[PDB]
């Protein structure tokens, strides 16, 4: 029943909501590491460990 441009609209709205929620989750993870240990160890494949 969904048109194929409508499916594109659905997946685009879903991805934008997912980016918003992932940035808020990164804020939560940094706040938790700041509260417990006093040192956050930011890592990643595209980011050297500091």
């Amino acid at each position: 029943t969904l048109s194929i441009a409508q499916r594109r609209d659905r997946v685009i709205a879903y991805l934008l909501m997912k980016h918003r929620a992932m940035h808020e989750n990164t804020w939560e993870w940094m706040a938790a590491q700041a509260a417990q240990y006093g040192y956050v160890d930011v890592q990643g494949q595209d980011y050297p460990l500091v």
């Binding site: 879903y14 997912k18 929620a21 992932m22 989750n25 990164t26 993870w29």
Partner: protein, 50 residues
């Protein structure tokens, strides 16, 4: 009496055991259908990543 005994009938004592409704109080929706089967969909949206 002579040929037999006289009787009086009182009220017919009756008992009607029912199994009343307990578990159907959580099943409110009623669906009638002439199709074969009833299909569902289930979607998990894993937001909680960093």
């Amino acid at each position: 009496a002579g040929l037999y005994t006289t009787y009086q009938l009182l009220e017919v004592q009756r008992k009607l055991k029912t199994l009343p409704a307990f578990f159907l109080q959580w099943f409110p929706r009623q669906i009638n259908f002439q199709e074969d089967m009833i299909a569902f969909d289930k979607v998990i949206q894993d937001v909680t990543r960093v």
